[PDB]
Amino acid sequence: FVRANPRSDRFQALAFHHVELWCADAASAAGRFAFALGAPLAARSDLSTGNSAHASLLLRSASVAFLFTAPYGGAATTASIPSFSPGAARRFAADHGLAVHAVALRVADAADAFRASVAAGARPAFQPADLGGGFGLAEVELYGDVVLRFVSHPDGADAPFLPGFEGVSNPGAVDYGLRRFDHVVGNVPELAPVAAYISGFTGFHEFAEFTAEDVGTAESGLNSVVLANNAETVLLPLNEPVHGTKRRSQIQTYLDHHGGPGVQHIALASDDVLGTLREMRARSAMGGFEFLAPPPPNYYDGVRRRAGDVLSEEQINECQELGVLVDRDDQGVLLQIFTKPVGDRPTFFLEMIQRIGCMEKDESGQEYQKGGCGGFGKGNFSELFKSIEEYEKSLE
Amino acid sequence: NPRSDRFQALAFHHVELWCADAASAAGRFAFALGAPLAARSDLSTGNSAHASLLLRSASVAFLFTAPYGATTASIPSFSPGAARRFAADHGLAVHAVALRVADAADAFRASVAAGARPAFQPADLGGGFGLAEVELYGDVVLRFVSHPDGADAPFLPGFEGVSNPGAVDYGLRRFDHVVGNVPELAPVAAYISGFTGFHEFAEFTGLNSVVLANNAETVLLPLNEPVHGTKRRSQIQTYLDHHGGPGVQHIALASDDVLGTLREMRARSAMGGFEFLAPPPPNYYDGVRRRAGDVLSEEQINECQELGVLVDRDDQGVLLQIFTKPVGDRPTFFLEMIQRIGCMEKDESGQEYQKGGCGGFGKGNFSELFKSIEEYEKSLE
Ligand SMILES: Cc1nnc(NC(=O)c2ccc(C(F)(F)F)n3c(CS(=O)(=O)C(C)C)nnc23)o1
Ligand SMILES: Cc1nnc(NC(=O)c2ccc(C(F)(F)F)n3c(CS(=O)(=O)C(C)C)nnc23)o1
Ligand SMILES: [Co+2]
Ligand SMILES: [Co+2]
Numbered sequence: 179f180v181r182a183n184p185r186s187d188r189f190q191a192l193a194f195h196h197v198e199l200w201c202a203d204a205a206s207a208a209g210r211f212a213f214a215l216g217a218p219l220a221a222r223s224d225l226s227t228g229n230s231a232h233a234s235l236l237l238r239s240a241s242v243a244f245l246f247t248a249p250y251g252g253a254a255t256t257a258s259i260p261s262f263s264p265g266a267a268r269r270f271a272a273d274h275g276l277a278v279h280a281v282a283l284r285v286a287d288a289a290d291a292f293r294a295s296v297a298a299g300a301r302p303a304f305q306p307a308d309l310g311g312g313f314g315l316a317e318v319e320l321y322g323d324v325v326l327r328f329v330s331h332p333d334g335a336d337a338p339f340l341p342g343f344e345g346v347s348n349p350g351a352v353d354y355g356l357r358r359f360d361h362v363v364g365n366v367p368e369l370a371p372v373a374a375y376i377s378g379f380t381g382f383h384e385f386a387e388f389t390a391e392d393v394g395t396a397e398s399g400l401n402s403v404v405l406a407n408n409a410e411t412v413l414l415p416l417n418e419p420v421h422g423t424k425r426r427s428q429i430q431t432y433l434d435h436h437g438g439p440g441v442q443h444i445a446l447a448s449d450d451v452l453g454t455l456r457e458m459r460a461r462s463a464m465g466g467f468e469f470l471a472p473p474p475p476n477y478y479d480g481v482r483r484r485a486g487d488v489l490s491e492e493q494i495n496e497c498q499e500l501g502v503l504v505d506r507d508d509q510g511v512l513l514q515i516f517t518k519p520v521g522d523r524p525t526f527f528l529e530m531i532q533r534i535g536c537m538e539k540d541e542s543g544q545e546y547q548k549g550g551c552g553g554f555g556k557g558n559f560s561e562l563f564k565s566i567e568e569y570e571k572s573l574e
Numbered sequence: 575n576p577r578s579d580r581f582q583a584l585a586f587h588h589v590e591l592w593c594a595d596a597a598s599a600a601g602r603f604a605f606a607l608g609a610p611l612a613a614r615s616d617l618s619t620g621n622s623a624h625a626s627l628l629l630r631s632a633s634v635a636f637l638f639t640a641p642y643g644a645t646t647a648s649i650p651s652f653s654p655g656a657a658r659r660f661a662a663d664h665g666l667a668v669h670a671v672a673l674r675v676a677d678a679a680d681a682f683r684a685s686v687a688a689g690a691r692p693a694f695q696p697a698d699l700g701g702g703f704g705l706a707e708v709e710l711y712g713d714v715v716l717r718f719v720s721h722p723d724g725a726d727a728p729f730l731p732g733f734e735g736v737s738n739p740g741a742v743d744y745g746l747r748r749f750d751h752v753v754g755n756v757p758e759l760a761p762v763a764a765y766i767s768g769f770t771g772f773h774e775f776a777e778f779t780g781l782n783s784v785v786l787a788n789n790a791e792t793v794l795l796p797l798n799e800p801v802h803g804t805k806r807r808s809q810i811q812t813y814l815d816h817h818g819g820p821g822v823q824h825i826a827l828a829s830d831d832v833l834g835t836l837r838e839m840r841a842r843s844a845m846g847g848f849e850f851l852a853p854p855p856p857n858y859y860d861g862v863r864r865r866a867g868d869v870l871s872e873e874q875i876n877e878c879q880e881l882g883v884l885v886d887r888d889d890q891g892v893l894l895q896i897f898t899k900p901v902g903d904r905p906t907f908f909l910e911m912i913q914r915i916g917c918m919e920k921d922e923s924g925q926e927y928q929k930g931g932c933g934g935f936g937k938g939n940f941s942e943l944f945k946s947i948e949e950y951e952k953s954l955e
């Protein structure tokens with residue numbers, strides 16, 4: 179945590195493009211995720227689009243783009259994602275269940291970002307192709323069975339997602355306010371070699387970094403590093419467990435139940451996460467996502483000190499009604515809530531956030547939003563535990 | 575009504591689906607059908623074998639079960655390798671059709687003795703519960719479950735109940751019929767009738783169908799087969815092709831107000847719920863305004879029109895009907911929402927009951943659909 183930014187990207191990583199989850203049936207996860215996140219179906223490539231290889235359904239809420247893909251029974255030239263391996267998809271679901279297979283970035287050229295990546299260490303995974311329309315697809319391995327997909331497309335274009343995908347516009351479809359992906363975090367057994375591997379090939383630089391003296395629940399804990407693209411728009415953190423602890427990490431609990439490295443959580447950022455949260459919790463009771471237990475009152479009594487200078491009492495009283503966590507950085511405020519495990523295993527979960535502050539000006543006096551404004555809520559580990567404990571003593 | 579049941583076949587207990595992840599289908603089916611989570615059996619209940627979630631709307635009981643990564647299994651038939659293959663081979667599909675029986679062990683021994691291929695040897699789940707399985711068709715088992723009348727565990731032993739406040743139903747009251755698609759009808763029916771003593775309710779000859787039923791005609795197990803030497807393509811062969819063999823084609827879920835139910839179901843369509851087939855052409859409804867004007871108001875038929883409900887009649891009773899689009903990724907499994915009007919006939923002590931099958935199964939509508947489609951296309955040049 180020097181916080182420098184050497185702009186060392188080896189390829190132009192413009193933005194997150196989508197995230198592809200694999201499973202045995204895409205209809206069902208897509209279904210739930212739509213209702214739960216307010217990310218209605220925006221595109222499909224199934225049998226009805228002439229694709230006999232895979233069934234791909236795509237949820238969108240603004241920039242947020244959750245792709246769900248699954249194999250049909252048993253062609254192959256009908257695939258719209260030609261990286262797709264039925265054999266490998268089947269394995270993935272058997273090994274993990276609901277989990278993220280790919281993390282896609284939009285880049286300048288897919289061919290180039292690969293070549294530069296592979297040349298700077300990256301393990302290949304899918305050899306660049308032209309999907310027509312001037313769309314490029316290329317994949318390198320990131321951690322474990324998770325791949326880093328590259329996607330390039332002329333700025334105008336047609337196929338809004340990928341060639342072969344037929345758009346979808348249900349009327350009655352409403353989003354809940356999720357604007358963008360913020361960060362995509364991977365649990366790994368040992369951090370150093372993984373961190374090196376990626377920065378090695380992407381040219382991403384360290385943005386932040388927390389070890390675990392009081393950054394890990396109880397005896398166990400985690401060692402987190404954050405890797406950032408030049409613009410600090412794309413953030414790929416990594417957790418590892420702290421070794422030789424007395425109790426077991428949840429980063430280890432993940433690794434065990436998941437059967438390897440993989441994406442632990444994805445943070446979905448909103449411009450009114452409170453408003454978003456209301457919609458999301460209304461669905462909780464009928465098949466949406468359920469959230470972690472609300473912090474006890476003491477927590478908030480504390481956020482009235484920490485962040486009362488920048489949050490109104492009407493805001494904080496709402497943050498409390500909705501179990502939202504609060505954290506400050508050098509110059510900003512992070513609102514933060516975590517879902518319960520989203521699939522069957524205590525593995526993957528989602529993070530809903532809002533970033534308040536850090537808006538700087540350029541060389542002509544134009545305001546931009548500094549990414550990572552508010553940090554990632556490292557304080558809430560420590561601050562939950564002590565309030566959770568102080569609560570219980572308050573009960574004799 | 576032969577009355578040949580070889581075991582005590584009380585009622586449908588549940589239908590169990592195998593996927594790679596129960597959370598997701600159980601979460602979706604929940605708000606698509608209005609069937610709130612009613613019971614779980616997973617890590618948080620000490621089961622590390624498998625993850626089961628039970629949706630319940632009245633008597634409708636949808637169980638979703640998925641393997642994890644020993645003695646901890648709540649359903650001790652579960653085999654993880656089987657599930658792995660099931661999901662891989664079918665996607666989302668019904669694995670188990672469960673009947674409530676008097677003893678289960680007895681149901682098994684009787685059944686097996688009368689031809690049934692064994693699947694799971696009788697267990698005692700505890701709390702007076704009995705569980706056994708035999709082969710129905712394909713991978714699909716017929717699961718016997720037996721409990722004491724009151725009992726404890728609402729579902730099965732090892733299952734913590736669930737009651738989120740703000741849960742709702744959309745009126746679905748029970749399972750009406752569970753239809754299986756097979757390649758050849760004659761052998762399958764022979765086998766099922768052979769071991770259950772279910773009798774033929776009726777027989778269609780699209781597809782060729784038979785409806786095996788229990789003594790009370792409360793449990794209905796239809797069976798279709800594709801038409802041999804077919805000129806076109808059968809929706810049953812399609813099924814058989816994309817699904818990779820015999821399996822449950824659809825399940826009809828009955829409602830006391832199918833039209834109110836439907837309203838609720840259709841509002842969820844846009845945000846991830848089920849979508850229903852295209853509505854029939856205007857002619858269709860002028861047709862029902864003829865064949866069924868005497869039993870349905872002019873205001874009722876107009877709601878059927880709004881919502882795409884189909885109508886049919888039998889000797890003495892009316893059928894409302896609406897099918898869902900394939901509920902999975904594959905064009906295989908779908909679901910029927912139906913209401914049965916009439917046929918509440920008396921016994922010999924006075925006590926009238928609702929007779930099963932009231933309104934038939936909508937078979938007629940097959941032709942009426944096709945004919946109204948043709949007609950409507952002509953009048954549009
Ligand atoms: C880098 C980077 N990106 N995000 C992060 N950190 C988190 O997401 C994070 C922050 C705070 C907390 C909490 F306050 F609640 F303890 N987190 C948790 C909670 S937990 O462990 O499920 C819990 C069940 C122990 N998970 N991730 C985070 O670091
Ligand atoms: C036995 C037994 N139990 N139920 C039945 N019949 C049906 O469910 C059934 C009735 C009517 C119709 C329809 F009106 F639309 F033609 N069905 C359909 C239509 S379909 O094929 O999806 C169509 C999309 C090819 N599927 N099952 C039925 O038979
Ligand atoms: Co580039
Ligand atoms: Co986070």
Ligand SMILES: [Co+2]
Pocket residue numbers: 581582583675676677678680681
């Ligand atoms: Co019996």
Ligand SMILES: [Co+2]
Pocket residue numbers: 751753824826910935
């Ligand atoms: Co039917």
